[PDB]
Amino acid sequence: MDVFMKGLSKAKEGVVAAAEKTKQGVAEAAGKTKEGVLYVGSKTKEGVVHGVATVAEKTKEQVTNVGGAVVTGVTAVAQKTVEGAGSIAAATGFVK
Amino acid sequence: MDVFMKGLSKAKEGVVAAAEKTKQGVAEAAGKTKEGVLYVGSKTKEGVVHGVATVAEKTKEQVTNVGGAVVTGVTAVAQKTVEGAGSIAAATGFVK
Amino acid sequence: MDVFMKGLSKAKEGVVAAAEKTKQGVAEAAGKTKEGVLYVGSKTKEGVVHGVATVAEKTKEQVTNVGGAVVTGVTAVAQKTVEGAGSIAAATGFVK
Amino acid sequence: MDVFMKGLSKAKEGVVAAAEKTKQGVAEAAGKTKEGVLYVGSKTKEGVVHGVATVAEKTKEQVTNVGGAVVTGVTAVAQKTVEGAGSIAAATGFVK
Amino acid sequence: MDVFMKGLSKAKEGVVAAAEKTKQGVAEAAGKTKEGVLYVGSKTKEGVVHGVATVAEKTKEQVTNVGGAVVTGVTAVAQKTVEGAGSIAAATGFVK
Amino acid sequence: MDVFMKGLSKAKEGVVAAAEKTKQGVAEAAGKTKEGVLYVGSKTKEGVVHGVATVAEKTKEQVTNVGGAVVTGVTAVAQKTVEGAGSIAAATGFVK
Amino acid sequence: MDVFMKGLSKAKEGVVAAAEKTKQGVAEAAGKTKEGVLYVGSKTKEGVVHGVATVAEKTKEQVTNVGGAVVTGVTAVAQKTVEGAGSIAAATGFVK
Amino acid sequence: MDVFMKGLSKAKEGVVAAAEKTKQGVAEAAGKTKEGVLYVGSKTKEGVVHGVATVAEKTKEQVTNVGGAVVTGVTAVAQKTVEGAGSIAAATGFVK
Amino acid sequence: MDVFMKGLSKAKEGVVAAAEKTKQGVAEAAGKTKEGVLYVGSKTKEGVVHGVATVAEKTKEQVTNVGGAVVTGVTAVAQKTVEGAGSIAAATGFVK
Amino acid sequence: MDVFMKGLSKAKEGVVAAAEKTKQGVAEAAGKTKEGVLYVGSKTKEGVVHGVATVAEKTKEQVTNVGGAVVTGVTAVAQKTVEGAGSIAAATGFVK
């Protein structure tokens, strides 16, 4: 069972260059990501929201958030005169 | 069972260059992503929302959000004079 | 069972370059993506919304959002003078 | 079982270049995407919305959204003087 | 069972370079990520929100957030004249 | 991948009986048999005879056998008043 | 990957009887048999006979056997008044 | 990966009877058998006979056997008035 | 990875009877058997016979056996008035 | 990884009976058997016969056996009026 290899697997005489995802100037709220996840035989239960019972009587104002994740803020980003953040991979093999 | 290889698998005499997804100036709210996920024989249950029972009587104002993820803010991005964020892969092999 | 290869599989004497999806100036709300997902024998249950029972009597105003993901904010992006974000792959092999 | 190859599979003496989809100046709301998904024997259940029961009596105003994903915001994008975002793949092999 | 290798596995005579994801000017709220997670035989239960019972009577103002994670602040980022943050990998082998 | 089932597979409400091959009064020499053999991806090499170089000069008598299997004996069988050797399978289900 | 089941697999509500091969009065020399053999990805080499170089000069008599298996004896069987050797399977289920 | 089950696998509500191969009055020489053998990824080398170099000069008699197995004896079997050796399986379930 | 089960595996509510191979009045010479053998990743080398160099000059008599196993004897069996040797399995479940 | 179970594994509410192989009046010479053998990652080398160099000059008689196992005797068996040797398994469960 061979999974998520980067580079030579069961292999020979090889040259491999792998970059990887860059991020610059990114604003995220309540995001979910899953990379390289393996489930074998497993039993899994995620994110269930059950039985929210918001009630109100006669109130003048009312706000309610129920979530696996709640963001109500300000998440600004500002940049002036910025360079770089790049990812570089260089591989050299078997030259003469 | 061989899955998600990058590069040589069961292979030989090879030169491989792989870049990977760049991001610049990206704003995300409540996003979900899944890359390189493998399920074998597994049993899985995700994101279920059950039994939300919002009620109101005689209220003057009422706001309610129920979610696997809730965003109500400001998530701006601003940039001036920005460079880079590139991903670069270079691979050189077996030259003469 | 061989899946999601990039590059040589069961192969030889090969030169491969692969770029990958760039993003610049992208704004996303409540998005879902699935890349490179494999299900074998698995039993899966996703995103179920069950039994939402929003009620109101005599209220003056009322707003309710029930969702796998809820966004009600502002997610703007602004850019001036921006460069790069490119993904580059270069592969050179077996030159004379 | 061989699926989603990019590059040489069961093959030899090959030169391959593959770019990948770029995005610039894209605004998305509640989108869903599925690339490279494989189901073998699996039993799957997605997106089900069941039993929504919105009610109102004598209310003055009322808004309700129930969704696999709900967006009520502003998701603008603005750009001036922007370059790049291109994806490039170059492959050279077996030159004389 | 061989999982998440980077570099040679069951392999020989190889040159491998691998970069890794850079981040610059990123602001996140309530985010979740999962990389290189392996479940074998296991039974797991995550994120469950159960039995939230927000109530109000005659109140003049009321705010309530119930979440696996709650953010209500300001998470700004600002930059002027910034460089670097790049990840670099260089691999050279078998040169004559 | 389901192979060599005897009985119910992915099935229900079933009654199955299966006898299996009997042998009585059988004499065998150098026999080869293969039942229920499965090869997946495998590379196999069987029975090769290479480079036999029998020589004789001026001999009076000479015998030579070279084989994957050599029998030069006597393999008789005798029987008087013999019974049985039968294979029996009986299956009864869901009777009223 | 499900192989060589006898009985219920992925199945329910079933009654199965399986007998299996009987042998009586059997004489075997140098025989080969393979039942329920599975090869996955394996590399196998069997029975090779290489470089036998039998030589003789001026001998009066000479006998030579070279084999993966050699039998030159007597392997007789005799029986008088013999019973049984039967294999019996009986399965009864869900009777009223 | 499920192999060589006898009985219920991933199954329920089942009744199974399995007999198994009987032998009575059997004479075997140099036999080979393989039941329920599983190879995964393995590399195997069996039975190789290499470089036998039988020589003779001027001998009056000469016998030579070279083999993975050699039998030159007498392996008789005799029986009078014999019973049994049967294999019996009985399974009873869910009777009213 | 589930192999060689007898009885319920991943299963419930079941009745299983398994007999097993009987032998009566059996004579064997140099036999080989393999039941329930599992190889994972392993590298194995069996039975190799290499470089047998039988020589003779002017001898009056000469016998030579070279083998993974050599039998030159007498292996008789005799029986009068014999009973039994049977294998019996009885399984009863869930009777009313 | 679950191997060679007899009875319930990962299972419940079950009745299992299993007999095991009987032997009566059996005579064996130089035999090899392998039951329930598991190799994981291992490297193994067995039975190698190397460099046998039998020589003779002018001898009147000569006998030579070189083997992983050598038998040259008498291994007879005789029986009169014999009973039993049977293996019995009985299993009863959940009777009303």
Side-chain angles (χ1 to χ4, degrees), chain A residues 58-90:
Chain A
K58 307 181 177 178
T59 66
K60 188 265 183 178
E61 273 167 344
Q62 176 160 349
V63 181
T64 287
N65 304 299
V66 184
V70 179
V71 180
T72 71
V74 176
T75 79
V77 176
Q79 294 185 306
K80 303 186 184 179
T81 308
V82 181
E83 303 179 12
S87 67
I88 302 180

PDB file of all heavy atoms in Angstrom, chain A residues 58-90:
ATOM      1  N   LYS A  58     -40.281  39.367  23.062  1.00  0.00           N
ATOM      2  CA  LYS A  58     -40.381  40.787  23.379  1.00  0.00           C
ATOM      3  C   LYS A  58     -39.043  41.520  23.382  1.00  0.00           C
ATOM      4  O   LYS A  58     -38.993  42.695  23.760  1.00  0.00           O
ATOM      5  CB  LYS A  58     -41.087  40.973  24.723  1.00  0.00           C
ATOM      6  CG  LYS A  58     -42.419  40.251  24.769  1.00  0.00           C
ATOM      7  CD  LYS A  58     -43.149  40.447  26.078  1.00  0.00           C
ATOM      8  CE  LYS A  58     -44.500  39.753  26.041  1.00  0.00           C
ATOM      9  NZ  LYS A  58     -45.235  39.868  27.326  1.00  0.00           N
ATOM     10  N   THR A  59     -37.958  40.873  22.969  1.00  0.00           N
ATOM     11  CA  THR A  59     -36.657  41.527  22.977  1.00  0.00           C
ATOM     12  C   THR A  59     -36.600  42.643  21.939  1.00  0.00           C
ATOM     13  O   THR A  59     -37.253  42.590  20.894  1.00  0.00           O
ATOM     14  CB  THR A  59     -35.538  40.522  22.714  1.00  0.00           C
ATOM     15  OG1 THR A  59     -35.658  40.004  21.385  1.00  0.00           O
ATOM     16  CG2 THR A  59     -35.619  39.380  23.700  1.00  0.00           C
ATOM     17  N   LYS A  60     -35.807  43.669  22.246  1.00  0.00           N
ATOM     18  CA  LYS A  60     -35.652  44.805  21.345  1.00  0.00           C
ATOM     19  C   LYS A  60     -34.602  44.531  20.271  1.00  0.00           C
ATOM     20  O   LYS A  60     -34.757  44.967  19.126  1.00  0.00           O
ATOM     21  CB  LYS A  60     -35.303  46.058  22.152  1.00  0.00           C
ATOM     22  CG  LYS A  60     -35.286  47.357  21.367  1.00  0.00           C
ATOM     23  CD  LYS A  60     -33.895  47.713  20.883  1.00  0.00           C
ATOM     24  CE  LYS A  60     -33.892  49.050  20.164  1.00  0.00           C
ATOM     25  NZ  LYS A  60     -32.527  49.442  19.717  1.00  0.00           N
ATOM     26  N   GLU A  61     -33.532  43.820  20.619  1.00  0.00           N
ATOM     27  CA  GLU A  61     -32.538  43.376  19.653  1.00  0.00           C
ATOM     28  C   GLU A  61     -31.984  42.037  20.103  1.00  0.00           C
ATOM     29  O   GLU A  61     -31.936  41.744  21.299  1.00  0.00           O
ATOM     30  CB  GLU A  61     -31.390  44.379  19.503  1.00  0.00           C
ATOM     31  CG  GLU A  61     -31.629  45.476  18.485  1.00  0.00           C
ATOM     32  CD  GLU A  61     -30.616  46.601  18.598  1.00  0.00           C
ATOM     33  OE1 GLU A  61     -29.924  46.681  19.636  1.00  0.00           O
ATOM     34  OE2 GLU A  61     -30.509  47.406  17.649  1.00  0.00           O
ATOM     35  N   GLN A  62     -31.576  41.219  19.137  1.00  0.00           N
ATOM     36  CA  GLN A  62     -31.026  39.906  19.450  1.00  0.00           C
ATOM     37  C   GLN A  62     -30.261  39.356  18.259  1.00  0.00           C
ATOM     38  O   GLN A  62     -30.787  39.315  17.145  1.00  0.00           O
ATOM     39  CB  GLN A  62     -32.127  38.926  19.854  1.00  0.00           C
ATOM     40  CG  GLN A  62     -31.620  37.522  20.093  1.00  0.00           C
ATOM     41  CD  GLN A  62     -32.565  36.709  20.937  1.00  0.00           C
ATOM     42  OE1 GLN A  62     -33.507  37.244  21.509  1.00  0.00           O
ATOM     43  NE2 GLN A  62     -32.320  35.410  21.022  1.00  0.00           N
ATOM     44  N   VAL A  63     -29.029  38.930  18.506  1.00  0.00           N
ATOM     45  CA  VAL A  63     -28.160  38.351  17.493  1.00  0.00           C
ATOM     46  C   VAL A  63     -27.665  37.023  18.038  1.00  0.00           C
ATOM     47  O   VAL A  63     -27.351  36.914  19.226  1.00  0.00           O
ATOM     48  CB  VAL A  63     -26.979  39.279  17.149  1.00  0.00           C
ATOM     49  CG1 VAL A  63     -26.115  38.664  16.066  1.00  0.00           C
ATOM     50  CG2 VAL A  63     -27.481  40.647  16.726  1.00  0.00           C
ATOM     51  N   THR A  64     -27.603  36.011  17.180  1.00  0.00           N
ATOM     52  CA  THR A  64     -27.166  34.697  17.626  1.00  0.00           C
ATOM     53  C   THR A  64     -26.488  33.960  16.485  1.00  0.00           C
ATOM     54  O   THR A  64     -27.050  33.853  15.394  1.00  0.00           O
ATOM     55  CB  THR A  64     -28.351  33.879  18.149  1.00  0.00           C
ATOM     56  OG1 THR A  64     -28.762  34.390  19.424  1.00  0.00           O
ATOM     57  CG2 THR A  64     -27.976  32.413  18.287  1.00  0.00           C
ATOM     58  N   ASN A  65     -25.287  33.461  16.740  1.00  0.00           N
ATOM     59  CA  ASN A  65     -24.551  32.660  15.779  1.00  0.00           C
ATOM     60  C   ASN A  65     -24.185  31.345  16.444  1.00  0.00           C
ATOM     61  O   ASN A  65     -23.599  31.343  17.528  1.00  0.00           O
ATOM     62  CB  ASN A  65     -23.292  33.386  15.314  1.00  0.00           C
ATOM     63  CG  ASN A  65     -23.586  34.752  14.739  1.00  0.00           C
ATOM     64  OD1 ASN A  65     -24.301  34.881  13.749  1.00  0.00           O
ATOM     65  ND2 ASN A  65     -23.028  35.784  15.358  1.00  0.00           N
ATOM     66  N   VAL A  66     -24.529  30.232  15.806  1.00  0.00           N
ATOM     67  CA  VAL A  66     -24.132  28.911  16.275  1.00  0.00           C
ATOM     68  C   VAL A  66     -23.545  28.150  15.100  1.00  0.00           C
ATOM     69  O   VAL A  66     -24.230  27.932  14.095  1.00  0.00           O
ATOM     70  CB  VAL A  66     -25.307  28.134  16.890  1.00  0.00           C
ATOM     71  CG1 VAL A  66     -24.821  26.819  17.455  1.00  0.00           C
ATOM     72  CG2 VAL A  66     -25.974  28.956  17.976  1.00  0.00           C
ATOM     73  N   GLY A  67     -22.287  27.752  15.216  1.00  0.00           N
ATOM     74  CA  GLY A  67     -21.566  27.237  14.072  1.00  0.00           C
ATOM     75  C   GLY A  67     -20.389  26.404  14.505  1.00  0.00           C
ATOM     76  O   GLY A  67     -19.863  26.577  15.605  1.00  0.00           O
ATOM     77  N   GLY A  68     -19.987  25.475  13.651  1.00  0.00           N
ATOM     78  CA  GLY A  68     -18.679  24.873  13.804  1.00  0.00           C
ATOM     79  C   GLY A  68     -17.543  25.875  13.894  1.00  0.00           C
ATOM     80  O   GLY A  68     -16.478  25.565  14.435  1.00  0.00           O
ATOM     81  N   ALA A  69     -17.760  27.083  13.372  1.00  0.00           N
ATOM     82  CA  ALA A  69     -16.818  28.187  13.509  1.00  0.00           C
ATOM     83  C   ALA A  69     -17.547  29.485  13.207  1.00  0.00           C
ATOM     84  O   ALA A  69     -18.293  29.554  12.228  1.00  0.00           O
ATOM     85  CB  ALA A  69     -15.622  28.016  12.569  1.00  0.00           C
ATOM     86  N   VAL A  70     -17.331  30.507  14.032  1.00  0.00           N
ATOM     87  CA  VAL A  70     -18.018  31.786  13.896  1.00  0.00           C
ATOM     88  C   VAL A  70     -16.978  32.894  13.857  1.00  0.00           C
ATOM     89  O   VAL A  70     -16.114  32.968  14.736  1.00  0.00           O
ATOM     90  CB  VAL A  70     -19.007  32.025  15.051  1.00  0.00           C
ATOM     91  CG1 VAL A  70     -19.688  33.354  14.889  1.00  0.00           C
ATOM     92  CG2 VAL A  70     -20.027  30.918  15.114  1.00  0.00           C
ATOM     93  N   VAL A  71     -17.062  33.756  12.844  1.00  0.00           N
ATOM     94  CA  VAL A  71     -16.222  34.944  12.728  1.00  0.00           C
ATOM     95  C   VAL A  71     -17.121  36.155  12.534  1.00  0.00           C
ATOM     96  O   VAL A  71     -17.921  36.191  11.594  1.00  0.00           O
ATOM     97  CB  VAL A  71     -15.221  34.834  11.570  1.00  0.00           C
ATOM     98  CG1 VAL A  71     -14.387  36.086  11.484  1.00  0.00           C
ATOM     99  CG2 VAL A  71     -14.332  33.630  11.763  1.00  0.00           C
ATOM    100  N   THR A  72     -16.994  37.145  13.418  1.00  0.00           N
ATOM    101  CA  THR A  72     -17.748  38.387  13.308  1.00  0.00           C
ATOM    102  C   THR A  72     -16.849  39.615  13.260  1.00  0.00           C
ATOM    103  O   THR A  72     -17.348  40.737  13.385  1.00  0.00           O
ATOM    104  CB  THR A  72     -18.744  38.533  14.461  1.00  0.00           C
ATOM    105  OG1 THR A  72     -18.033  38.795  15.674  1.00  0.00           O
ATOM    106  CG2 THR A  72     -19.557  37.271  14.635  1.00  0.00           C
ATOM    107  N   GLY A  73     -15.543  39.439  13.100  1.00  0.00           N
ATOM    108  CA  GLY A  73     -14.597  40.527  13.227  1.00  0.00           C
ATOM    109  C   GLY A  73     -14.296  41.259  11.937  1.00  0.00           C
ATOM    110  O   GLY A  73     -15.075  41.251  10.983  1.00  0.00           O
ATOM    111  N   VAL A  74     -13.139  41.917  11.924  1.00  0.00           N
ATOM    112  CA  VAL A  74     -12.529  42.481  10.724  1.00  0.00           C
ATOM    113  C   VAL A  74     -11.146  41.872  10.544  1.00  0.00           C
ATOM    114  O   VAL A  74     -10.325  41.915  11.466  1.00  0.00           O
ATOM    115  CB  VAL A  74     -12.437  44.013  10.809  1.00  0.00           C
ATOM    116  CG1 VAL A  74     -11.717  44.562   9.599  1.00  0.00           C
ATOM    117  CG2 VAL A  74     -13.821  44.613  10.928  1.00  0.00           C
ATOM    118  N   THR A  75     -10.886  41.306   9.367  1.00  0.00           N
ATOM    119  CA  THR A  75      -9.658  40.558   9.120  1.00  0.00           C
ATOM    120  C   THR A  75      -8.902  41.115   7.919  1.00  0.00           C
ATOM    121  O   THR A  75      -8.390  40.370   7.086  1.00  0.00           O
ATOM    122  CB  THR A  75      -9.945  39.076   8.911  1.00  0.00           C
ATOM    123  OG1 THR A  75     -10.413  38.871   7.579  1.00  0.00           O
ATOM    124  CG2 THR A  75     -11.004  38.594   9.879  1.00  0.00           C
ATOM    125  N   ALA A  76      -8.825  42.438   7.822  1.00  0.00           N
ATOM    126  CA  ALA A  76      -8.192  43.094   6.688  1.00  0.00           C
ATOM    127  C   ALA A  76      -6.712  42.732   6.587  1.00  0.00           C
ATOM    128  O   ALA A  76      -6.083  42.295   7.550  1.00  0.00           O
ATOM    129  CB  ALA A  76      -8.343  44.609   6.800  1.00  0.00           C
ATOM    130  N   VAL A  77      -6.165  42.905   5.385  1.00  0.00           N
ATOM    131  CA  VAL A  77      -4.729  42.852   5.132  1.00  0.00           C
ATOM    132  C   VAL A  77      -4.366  44.027   4.232  1.00  0.00           C
ATOM    133  O   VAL A  77      -5.095  44.337   3.285  1.00  0.00           O
ATOM    134  CB  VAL A  77      -4.315  41.512   4.485  1.00  0.00           C
ATOM    135  CG1 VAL A  77      -2.847  41.512   4.129  1.00  0.00           C
ATOM    136  CG2 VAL A  77      -4.622  40.362   5.411  1.00  0.00           C
ATOM    137  N   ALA A  78      -3.251  44.691   4.532  1.00  0.00           N
ATOM    138  CA  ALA A  78      -2.743  45.772   3.700  1.00  0.00           C
ATOM    139  C   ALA A  78      -1.268  45.560   3.404  1.00  0.00           C
ATOM    140  O   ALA A  78      -0.507  45.157   4.285  1.00  0.00           O
ATOM    141  CB  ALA A  78      -2.940  47.125   4.378  1.00  0.00           C
ATOM    142  N   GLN A  79      -0.864  45.818   2.160  1.00  0.00           N
ATOM    143  CA  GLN A  79       0.541  45.738   1.786  1.00  0.00           C
ATOM    144  C   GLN A  79       0.916  46.880   0.855  1.00  0.00           C
ATOM    145  O   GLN A  79       0.141  47.245  -0.031  1.00  0.00           O
ATOM    146  CB  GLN A  79       0.866  44.411   1.094  1.00  0.00           C
ATOM    147  CG  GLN A  79       0.741  43.188   1.970  1.00  0.00           C
ATOM    148  CD  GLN A  79       1.198  41.941   1.259  1.00  0.00           C
ATOM    149  OE1 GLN A  79       0.734  41.635   0.169  1.00  0.00           O
ATOM    150  NE2 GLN A  79       2.118  41.217   1.871  1.00  0.00           N
ATOM    151  N   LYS A  80       2.106  47.442   1.063  1.00  0.00           N
ATOM    152  CA  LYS A  80       2.764  48.302   0.087  1.00  0.00           C
ATOM    153  C   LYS A  80       4.211  47.865  -0.074  1.00  0.00           C
ATOM    154  O   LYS A  80       4.892  47.615   0.923  1.00  0.00           O
ATOM    155  CB  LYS A  80       2.717  49.772   0.503  1.00  0.00           C
ATOM    156  CG  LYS A  80       1.326  50.318   0.723  1.00  0.00           C
ATOM    157  CD  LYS A  80       1.369  51.809   0.995  1.00  0.00           C
ATOM    158  CE  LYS A  80      -0.012  52.353   1.313  1.00  0.00           C
ATOM    159  NZ  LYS A  80       0.029  53.810   1.611  1.00  0.00           N
ATOM    160  N   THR A  81       4.675  47.772  -1.317  1.00  0.00           N
ATOM    161  CA  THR A  81       6.072  47.460  -1.629  1.00  0.00           C
ATOM    162  C   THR A  81       6.521  46.158  -0.956  1.00  0.00           C
ATOM    163  O   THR A  81       7.235  46.153   0.042  1.00  0.00           O
ATOM    164  CB  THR A  81       6.983  48.627  -1.234  1.00  0.00           C
ATOM    165  OG1 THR A  81       6.484  49.837  -1.814  1.00  0.00           O
ATOM    166  CG2 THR A  81       8.395  48.395  -1.743  1.00  0.00           C
ATOM    167  N   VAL A  82       6.066  45.043  -1.519  1.00  0.00           N
ATOM    168  CA  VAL A  82       6.353  43.727  -0.961  1.00  0.00           C
ATOM    169  C   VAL A  82       6.869  42.816  -2.067  1.00  0.00           C
ATOM    170  O   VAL A  82       6.430  42.910  -3.217  1.00  0.00           O
ATOM    171  CB  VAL A  82       5.104  43.121  -0.286  1.00  0.00           C
ATOM    172  CG1 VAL A  82       5.418  41.772   0.296  1.00  0.00           C
ATOM    173  CG2 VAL A  82       4.584  44.045   0.797  1.00  0.00           C
ATOM    174  N   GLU A  83       7.817  41.946  -1.719  1.00  0.00           N
ATOM    175  CA  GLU A  83       8.502  41.087  -2.673  1.00  0.00           C
ATOM    176  C   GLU A  83       8.608  39.685  -2.092  1.00  0.00           C
ATOM    177  O   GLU A  83       8.332  39.459  -0.913  1.00  0.00           O
ATOM    178  CB  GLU A  83       9.896  41.622  -3.013  1.00  0.00           C
ATOM    179  CG  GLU A  83       9.908  43.037  -3.560  1.00  0.00           C
ATOM    180  CD  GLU A  83      11.308  43.534  -3.855  1.00  0.00           C
ATOM    181  OE1 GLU A  83      12.247  42.711  -3.850  1.00  0.00           O
ATOM    182  OE2 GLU A  83      11.472  44.749  -4.092  1.00  0.00           O
ATOM    183  N   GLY A  84       9.003  38.734  -2.935  1.00  0.00           N
ATOM    184  CA  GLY A  84       9.276  37.388  -2.465  1.00  0.00           C
ATOM    185  C   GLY A  84       8.074  36.477  -2.311  1.00  0.00           C
ATOM    186  O   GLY A  84       7.209  36.415  -3.188  1.00  0.00           O
ATOM    187  N   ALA A  85       8.024  35.759  -1.190  1.00  0.00           N
ATOM    188  CA  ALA A  85       7.063  34.700  -0.886  1.00  0.00           C
ATOM    189  C   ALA A  85       7.057  33.552  -1.892  1.00  0.00           C
ATOM    190  O   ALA A  85       6.208  32.661  -1.790  1.00  0.00           O
ATOM    191  CB  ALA A  85       5.643  35.258  -0.748  1.00  0.00           C
ATOM    192  N   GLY A  86       7.963  33.538  -2.866  1.00  0.00           N
ATOM    193  CA  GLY A  86       7.977  32.455  -3.832  1.00  0.00           C
ATOM    194  C   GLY A  86       8.676  31.214  -3.304  1.00  0.00           C
ATOM    195  O   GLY A  86       9.603  31.287  -2.503  1.00  0.00           O
ATOM    196  N   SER A  87       8.233  30.055  -3.784  1.00  0.00           N
ATOM    197  CA  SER A  87       8.846  28.775  -3.453  1.00  0.00           C
ATOM    198  C   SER A  87       9.543  28.210  -4.679  1.00  0.00           C
ATOM    199  O   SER A  87       8.959  28.174  -5.764  1.00  0.00           O
ATOM    200  CB  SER A  87       7.813  27.776  -2.931  1.00  0.00           C
ATOM    201  OG  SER A  87       6.897  27.408  -3.939  1.00  0.00           O
ATOM    202  N   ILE A  88      10.781  27.761  -4.503  1.00  0.00           N
ATOM    203  CA  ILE A  88      11.641  27.361  -5.608  1.00  0.00           C
ATOM    204  C   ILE A  88      12.235  26.000  -5.283  1.00  0.00           C
ATOM    205  O   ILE A  88      12.706  25.777  -4.163  1.00  0.00           O
ATOM    206  CB  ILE A  88      12.760  28.388  -5.863  1.00  0.00           C
ATOM    207  CG1 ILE A  88      12.170  29.766  -6.151  1.00  0.00           C
ATOM    208  CG2 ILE A  88      13.656  27.941  -6.998  1.00  0.00           C
ATOM    209  CD1 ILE A  88      13.209  30.824  -6.413  1.00  0.00           C
ATOM    210  N   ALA A  89      12.198  25.089  -6.252  1.00  0.00           N
ATOM    211  CA  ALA A  89      12.851  23.794  -6.144  1.00  0.00           C
ATOM    212  C   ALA A  89      13.691  23.569  -7.387  1.00  0.00           C
ATOM    213  O   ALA A  89      13.199  23.743  -8.504  1.00  0.00           O
ATOM    214  CB  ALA A  89      11.830  22.671  -5.983  1.00  0.00           C
ATOM    215  N   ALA A  90      14.951  23.192  -7.201  1.00  0.00           N
ATOM    216  CA  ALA A  90      15.856  22.943  -8.314  1.00  0.00           C
ATOM    217  C   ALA A  90      16.600  21.640  -8.081  1.00  0.00           C
ATOM    218  O   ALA A  90      17.193  21.446  -7.016  1.00  0.00           O
ATOM    219  CB  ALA A  90      16.847  24.095  -8.491  1.00  0.00           C
TER     220      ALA A  90
END
